[PDB]
C-alpha cells in the first residue's frame, strides 16, 4: 500500500482516536473515490479493460481497510466503546471490523474469487431449448410477466431455477464457511449476527415477527383474491382453492411482486387505467426534462437542487454511440462531497418518471449528509435509503400530483378508481412483504448452521410456503438450490433492509402528509410544495448514520420503532374491499392443504 495511504502513529486514547479518524477520512475519500469512479467507468462503458481497472480499485480499497482496521483494533479495541463522542464510537467501531481481511491470505483470495464466480454464474445462466437460449434479462422476465400459458411459464420457471441454482450450491457452501470464519474474528457468532447488528436492536427478530403478524391478514386476503382469479384462468387441475399458489403464475420469477397480473384481477375493469405516458409523449418530454421535473419537486420542498456536477456527469439516457452499459437505474455517491450521479437508460413513461424521483431521492440523501465523516454517509439503518426513495414515489404516483405537473387534466373521484389504484399498489407493496421477510430468515439459518447444505432447498421451500403461500410447480429435491436463483443470494446482498423499507416508507408517508397539513385518504396525499414536509425530510437525511436510527425515526414520525399501522392505514379501503370479496366467494384464507403440488402438464416439456 502506498505509504501516504497507510496509517501513521496515533495514541491509544480518545484524543488520539479523533486524530486517527480524521486521517482515516482523508485517505478513505481517495480510496473510495477511485473505486466508485472505476465502477462508473465500467458501468457506463462495459469493456474488459474497464472491468480490470475496477478490480484493481476494489482490491486497493480492501488493502486500505485492512491496514487501517488492524491499526484501529491494535490501538482502540479495549477502549473505543467508552469514548464520550458517540459519532467517534460509530466511526472507530466500523473501522475495527475487518470482515474478510481477517482471513489468511490464500483464503482471502478464495473468498474474493467465490464472490466473483457466484456473481458470474448468475449473470450468465440461461435457459436453452430443444435447439438459441433465453436470458433472465429480458427474455425470461418478459415470459413470467406476460405469458398466460401455464406450460410456458413452467418451462421458464423450472429452466431458470435449475440453470441458476444448481451450479451455485457448491460455491455458496464454501462462501458460507469462509464468511463465518472471517466475522468470527470480528467478534460475531456468524455472518448473520453481523448483518443483524446493523439494526442495533436486542430484539430485532422478535420485532420483525410482531410486525409481520400485523401485516399477514392483508397478505392472506390479497393471496386468496388473486388465487381465485388464477383458478378461473388455469382451472381446478392447476389451482387448489385451499392450497398454495404455484410459484410461476404471479407475473414474476420469484412471485415477489404481482403487478404484472393486474389485468386478471382488476377490481373495476370498465374504469380507465391511470397511465399518462402518452400525454408525456405528446408534450415532447424527454429524459432530461423528466429529471428537471424531478428536481423541481425537491426544490418545491426547499430541498437542494441537483448541483452542476450531477448534470455534467450523469448518464440519463442510453448512449447513442452504441456503448454497452448497465441500464438499470442507480444513484451514485463518489464520497468526495462533489460528484453525485444517476445512471439510467431513461424512457419516457409514467413509471419511469416515478423511478426518476425515487433515484433522485437517493441523490438528495447524499447531498444532505455529505458534510459528515465518510463512515457516516449512509442511511440511518440499511432500510432508510429505499424507504426515502419510495415515499417520494408514493406522492408522485398519485393522479393528484400528475394533475399538478400538467400530465392529467381531470382527477376522477369515484371510489372504483380508488380501489383500482390501491389494488395495483397492493400487488407491488403487499405481495412483496412475505418475500422480503423470508430471504434473510433463510440465510440466517444457513449462516448459523441450522440449515446445512443437506437441507438448503427443504428450508427454502418451508419458508416460501409458510410466508408466501406458494409451492414449486415441479418437484424439487436437494440437488436443487432455488435460493441461489435470486440475485441477492449469490451476490451476497442483504435483504431484510427491503422488508424494513416497505414498512418504513408508509411511516414516513403518514408523518410527512400530516406535516404537510394534508387531510383525507392517505393514498391521495401529495407532499409536493410542502416546505414543512421538506424541513422534516431535511432533518432525517442530513443525519446520515451519525445517530441511532430509532431516535432519528422518533424525531420524524413520533415513534422510536418500526410500526405496521401506517401501512394498514394507507390500504384500509382496499383491505375492506378484499375482505368483502373473499367472504362473498366463501374463500379459505391460507393454504390448509400444505402438501399440495400441481401436476405436470401432459407431455411436458414437448410444447410450444
Ligand atoms: C433429485 O432430482 C434429480 C433431478 O430429477 C428431476 O427432479 C426430480 C425431483 C424428479 O422430479 C425427476 O423426475 C426430475 O427429472 C434426480 O436426477 C435425475 O435422476 C433420474 C432418475 O430418476 C435420472 O434419469 C436423471 O438423469 C437425473 N437428472 C439429472 C439432471 O441428473 C435425482 O435422482 C433426484 N434425487 C436425488 C437424491 O438426487
Ligand atoms: C470506453 O472504454 C475504453 C477503454 O476500454 C476507452 O478506450 C480507450 O480510450 C483511451 C482514450 O480516452 C485510449 O487512450 C485507450 O487506448 C482506449 N483503450 C482501448 C482498449 O482502445 C473508450 O474511449 C471508452 N469510451 C468512452 C465513450 O468513454
Ligand atoms: Ca426492486
Ligand atoms: Cl440489511
Ligand atoms: Mg412501480
Ligand atoms: Zn432505490
Residue numbers in the entry: 1 to 131, 135 to 611
Question: Anything the authors wrote about it?
Answer:
Angiotensin‐1‐converting enzyme (ACE) is a key enzyme in the renin–angiotensin–aldosterone and kinin systems where it cleaves angiotensin I and bradykinin peptides, respectively. However, ACE also participates in numerous other physiological functions, can hydrolyse many peptide substrates and has various exo‐ and endopeptidase activities. ACE achieves this complexity by containing two homologous catalytic domains (N‐ and C‐domains), which exhibit different substrate specificities. Analysis of these structures provides important insights into how structural features of the ACE domains are able to accommodate the wide variety of substrates and allow different peptidase activities.
Here, we present the first open conformation structures of ACE N‐domain and a unique closed C‐domain structure (2.0 Å) where the C terminus of a symmetry‐related molecule is observed inserted into the active‐site cavity and binding to the zinc ion.
